[PDB]
């Protein structure tokens, strides 16, 4: 459908939150200096 186009929008958001997690896991694993 076009709902299936928002599925890719939900997928796209989950996917990007994931990269914000790593960026932030980075800040911490570094902020242990």
């Amino acid at each position: 459908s076009g709902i299936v186009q928002q599925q890719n929008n939900l997928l796209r958001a989950i996917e990007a939150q994931q990269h914000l997690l790593q960026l932030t896991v980075w800040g911490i694993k570094q902020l242990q200096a």
């Binding site: 709902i3 928002q6 929008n9 958001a13 990007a16 990269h19 914000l20």
Partner: protein, 36 residues
């Protein structure tokens, strides 16, 4: 810089809150074919 790559991070968290826009507004269109 510091407060630069902290611009980049907070203005990606801009992008994701852009995707979360598009997704909430293919929803309140699915609340459209559920009017019928």
């Amino acid at each position: 810089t510091w407060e630069x790559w902290d611009x980049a991070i907070a203005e990606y968290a801009x992008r994701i809150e852009x995707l979360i826009x598009a997704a909430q507004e293919q929803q309140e269109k699915n609340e459209x074919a559920l009017x019928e």
